[PDB]
Structures are given as structure tokens and as C-alpha cells.
From a paper:
The N-terminal domain of [name] (aa 1–149) can form a dimer and be assembled into a capsid with an icosahedral symmetry composed of 180 (T = 3 state) or 240 (T = 4 state) subunits. In the HAF sequence, the affibody was inserted between α4 and α5 of the [name], the spike tip of the [name]. The affibody used in this study specifically binds to the extracellular domain of EGFR with a dissociation constant (KD) of 5.4 nM.
HAF was expressed in E. coli and self-assembled into a spherical capsid form. The four subunits forming the asymmetric unit of HAF (T = 4 state) are colored in red, blue, green, and yellow. Each linker composed of 10 or more residues made the affibody flexible, and thus the structure of the affibody in HAF could not be clearly confirmed even though the molecular structure of HAF was obtained.
Residue numbers in the entry:
A (entry chain A), B (entry chain B), C (entry chain B), D (entry chain A), E (entry chain D), F (entry chain B): 49 to 126, 278 to 340
Write the structure that this text describes.
């Protein structure tokens, strides 16, 4: 009975991201590797630049505690183990990837640029498939 | 793989929070009620004041999706349930409350004041029981 | 139908007063005696100082007409009486004392000081009983 | 053994209103609807303008708790239920309507204007019915 | 879940229209004839004057498509037809007339004057019938 | 016939002193010893400093003549004695100590400081025993 949209300090409420297809976001491993490779200083050093990585830290932490839960259910629990593991991938997996993808993207190209791409992607997906040019991820610095 | 400390950039490394006993932290319902009663503006309005409530949002959200997972396993799954619900209460229940307790405490009394309280509590608990003053959590605005 | 909070325009929403336990508030006779002894001028003289005593007047009047109703049901009505007298004591007795207790307390010590006392009492009661300082109502002019 | 006249900060002691006939005041529903329709901002917003609505709030609240008492005696209690309900309409009903009518009227036309109308109404009712012109509610902004 | 009422840009929220009795508003035919006779260029010419006629247009269109649906159900459906038509007039017809009545009235006599007329009629109907001066719709340029 | 309050012209009406329990006041011998040890100059030298010791003189004198009456009834009178000696101890013993206790206390710590102590003690005692801090008489120069 608490309803808070994470994406309100930066605009682009949660309803905006619902347009993007579920399978459009790349896998968790690629996003984690991108965050680690591009951003090792910011995540490790205490110097504060923006709330983006400030929230990215606990995003990674909630993902990690979910991974530890998966390891626990694999090791200590009893068929019934694989099904819960599959569920968290499809249930929390979508949310975690959305959190990771938005914050990484807005750090590289800027938070303003991703806004227009989100708006344009909404227009392109609303048109019926009878006539739509092939659109791909188009972001430029 | 690799570990990062969320409590950083406010001082108060993770090692300091290990001073406090596990059972000292109050129950989740009290923290949620206090956060609601004291703050309905910051959690809902888009205005930014500090990263504290910024991280509080994802903390509440990760707790909420944990509750949703508990509801799903209650509704769909088969003696194997109550052990899972108890486990997350004793394992993630401690971890989640730590994030919530620190942030609400440092919002009212300030992030500077809570630091010496952690130091003072550490000193108080390390003394032998043969002579110790009965201590209660002393915080005044 | 619709609800309004009397404690508003002084801060101190209704949710804050839910922190205090029901039995904490002292008995009606003590509050009436304290109000009489400390204030016979404000309650009688037409001079206005603050809305506090202004609302205190109607509070006392609603309590008085409740007492008159109790006297009437004692004098005129028929085992069905004592259950009514007990019910109003346990239902309206709590509600009336809340109005009286807040107003007299914020007159002597000030409306600003009572606020942090509510916050401090909330913090004190939310901690687990395994370690808590024995607290008494600390108010000093 | 407490005697306080509510109407002393604004003048027009309780003895002044005793002149007006009991059935002159309109029904509670009409006064509540008038207060709601004309004054939704003042009753809801914390901004303070005058003690009028400041007392109107607890007037409505005491009426509401009386209504809840009526609902309780209707639902939980056992002939003996209708009679107490009828009594509160004639006993507290007159007082509540007087409180509501005075404060609503003095907000619209001003607190000074209602004073003259009360004085003149006293003169008109003191004359024996042998010769009195028909007088009606006459208030103008 | 959508909750919004039209009467905000002009003030006078929907609660104000609840004072005036339902049967007070005249029938749809008279309002339509008045709108057609007094304002034919405003409804037809694209010239902009105020949002009043701007909303009046879709008011008329929504009423007209309701009439078209009524004709469709009359011609196509099978007792069950008449009750639906009587239903829409008593349920939807009242709401439509409020839009037309407010906008037509505020164009001739002005949006300012009609506001005081609303409260004046509201308080006038609340006074007891034993004393009320004879009042009718009083609107003068 | 008619009653006057001695404690007047220093604030602290008689009603305030009714807050303190009867047995709280210490025994007469301790008060006399404290008055002697702290003040031998004021009680003997003719110099005037305040009405406090001025009234203290007649207080001690009325107590002394009561003691003389006790000695006389012991020496001259006849089971009827000890009931009289006990009665004056329980009836005038309370009254005399009140005069002495107030005056010596307000001489050392000052008449201004003792006022809030009476208020603070009243607040402390009115709270229910379910939660109260153990209070001792806190007075510091």
C-alpha cells in the first residue's frame, strides 16, 4: 500500500518505460560488466557526483542479496528449487535491468538525451506494424 | 564476486554498524510507520533534498518486491513455505532494517549526530558487565 | 462522511499522537484541576491570547454536556446504564483527554517544545525491550 | 461546576442568543452543507484566519462523535435506543446549531453586522403580539 | 482511476453546484434553443473568445452522440428500451444540463456575477420556511 | 468566616501547594535545624532583607506556643492527652511545615526557581504509574 515511482527526481515516470519491450533490455551480466568496467572509481570512491550511482549501489546490492537467496535455495533447500529461481529472473529481473539500464545510459550520453529517445521510441511502437521503418537503438554523444 | 559498502560517503563504514547487536533494530512496521508519518512529502514529491530519501525509495521497493514474492509463494507453492518466510525475515529482515534505520535517524537528528552515537554505543557495550550504566538510545534534536 | 484533523495548524498531525499509548494520558480530574489552578484568567476573561484556550472552551463544554447526559440517563433510565457510562469513559474518555492534554501542555512549555517530545517518545517506544532507558515525561520550562 | 460562556471573545454573551426561538435555527444538515460548500479551503488548509473556523472544527468533531455514539447505540445496544437518540437531537442539537449558525453567519456578513440583528431581534420579540410587524431574517452584505 | 471535475479554471468547483436543487435546472430543449438563438457565430465561426464556448462545443457533441446511441438502441433493441432512455435522462441528463446552464449564464451576465448568485441562492434555501423573503432567479446585466 | 492565602504576593497560590502529597514534607526537626544552621544572622539581627524571614519569625513563634500548650497539657491535664498531641501533629503539623518548607526553600534557591519545581512535580505525579521516571527533589543553586 505504498506507491512510489523511482523515476521522479529525473522525470520520466515509470509509465514512460512501460512502452519499451521486455526483451529489449540486454542481460544482467552485460550491464554489470559495463558498470564495472566503465565505472570503478565512482562506485568505489566516496566522492559524490550525482544520485545516479548513489542509487546504483543499492540496486546492485538488492540484486546481490537476491543472488545469495538463489544460492541458499540451491544449497540448503530440497524440482521446487529451479522454479523459484526461474521466477525471480522474470519477476525481479525485469525491474533490476530497468534500474541498471536507465542509470548507466543517462551517465554516458547525459540524462536529457535519453529522454528524447524514450519519447521517440513511444511514437514508433504505437504505429501499427502495417508501416514502420526499422528502428534500432540510436544514441549518440 | 566484488563487494561495495552502501553506508559510505556519509562516513560510517560497515564495520561501525557491526557494533550494534542484531536484535537492537526495531521491527519493520514501526520504521515504515515512522517514515510515513514524518515524511509524506519527500517520498512523493519530485523535489530532491539529499540522497537519503533517494536511497530510501529503492530500499522500500526492494522490500516491497520481497513481500510480493512472499505473497506469490504463499498463493501458488505447496511445509516448505513457512521455512522460507522465516528465513527471509531473519536474513534479509536484518539487512533491510539497517538501511531504513540509518536513513530515518540521520534525517531527523542529522547525519553528524548519529556518528558519535555509534561510537558511544560501541564504547558502552565493550565494557564488562561488572560495571555498566544502563543505556537507552539517547537522541535529542 | 468526511474527516478533518483538529490538531492541524500547530504541526502535530493526528498520526503523531498515535505514537502515545492509550493509557499514557492522565485522568480527566487531574487535567481539569491543572487547567483550573494554572488558568482562571484566560478561561473567564474575554481577552484572547491564542486559539489554544479558545478550543479548550468548547472541549470543556462538550465534556460537560456529556456529563449532563450521563446524569440524565442515571436519573431517568432504568443494568443498561453502567455499560453506557463505561463505554463513553473508554471511547470518548480517550478522545477528550487528547484534546485537553495537548493544549495545556503546549501552553506552559510552549507549542514548539512539545513537538520533539512526541518525536522523542516515538523513538523511545519503538526500540526493542532488550535494551531501553526507563523514560519519564521530561518537560522543563 | 464550571461556567464559561463561549461567546465572550466576540461579545454577545450566551444570554443574548437565548432570545431567539428554538425552532428558528435551520436543521443540522443544511448548516453542515453550507459550511462544506462555502468553506472547504479554510477548514482543510492549515492557514489560520480567525478563531471562528478554529472553533468550528471541534464543533463539527463533537457533533460527529455524538453521531458515532448514535450509530453505536443503534448497532450494539438492544425501544430504549430511539429515545436516547431523540433526546440528543433536542438536548445537544440546540447547542450545536447555535454554535454552527453564529460562526457561519459572522463569517459571511461580518461579526459586527450580526450583532445589530441580534439586538433588533430582541426588541421585536419583547413586544406583545398585539402589535408587531412581520419580521423575517434580514441580513445584507 | 481518474478523478477530475471541469469547473476548476473558472473556479466554483462541483461541490458548489450541489446546493441548488436538481429540479431547479430547466430542460435541455430550452437551453439548446437559447444557445442556438443567442450564439450562432460563436458555435460556428472559428474565432476565439473564451474557453466557455470552447467546452460548450464538445458538451453539445457528447449530448448529441448520446442521443444517437439512444436512437440506435430504440431502432435495434427489442420494455427494456424505454427504461434505458428514462435512465440516461435522469442520470446523464442532469450532468449535461449543469454544463450548459453554467456556461450560458456566465456568458450573458458574466462569470463574476453568477458566482455570488450561487451562494446567495444556496443560503436562501437553507433558512427555515417560517421566515424567508420570496426570491427567484435574479440576474441583471 | 473569611479566608486569605498566605502564599500570595509570591505567586504560588494555595491550589499549587495541593499538588504535593501530605507526607512529602520533611519532619519539623530537620526544617528547624536547617533554618538554624543556614540562618542565625537574619533570625536574630534586626536587619530586614525580605518578608520571607519576617513571616518565618511568627511561624516559629506560633509553633513554639503550640509546643508550650503541649507541655502545659502534659503537666497539668489528666488517656485524653496523647490523642490531642497526635491530633495537633497530624493537623497543624502539616500546616506549619508548609509555611516553613516554602520559605527556606525559596531563600536558598530563590523564589523564582521553586515555582517551576511545583509545576514540574505536578506534571510528574499526574502521569499514570504505567510509565513514570523516578523523581527526586531536584534543586541546584
Amino acid at each position: 500500500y505504498y506507491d512510489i515511482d523511482p523515476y521522479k527526481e529525473f522525470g520520466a515516470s515509470v509509465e514512460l518505460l512501460s512502452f519499451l519491450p521486455s526483451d529489449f533490455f540486454p542481460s544482467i551480466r552485460d550491464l554489470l560488466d559495463t558498470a564495472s568496467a566503465l565505472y570503478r572509481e565512482a562506485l568505489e570512491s566516496p566522492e559524490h557526483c550525482s544520485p545516479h550511482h548513489t542509487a546504483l549501489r543499492q540496486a546492485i546490492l538488492c540484486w546481490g542479496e537476491l543472488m545469495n537467496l538463489a544460492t541458499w535455495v540451491g544449497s540448503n533447500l530440497e524440482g521446487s528449487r529451479e522454479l523459484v529461481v526461474s521466477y525471480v529472473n522474470v519477476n525481479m529481473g525485469l525491474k533490476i535491468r530497468q534500474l541498471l539500464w536507465f542509470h548507466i545510459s543517462c551517465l554516458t550520453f547525459g540524462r536529457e538525451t535519453v529522454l528524447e529517445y524514450l519519447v521517440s521510441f513511444g511514437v514508433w511502437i504505437r504505429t501499427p506494424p502495417a508501416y514502420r521503418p526499422p528502428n534500432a537503438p540510436i544514441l549518440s554523444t
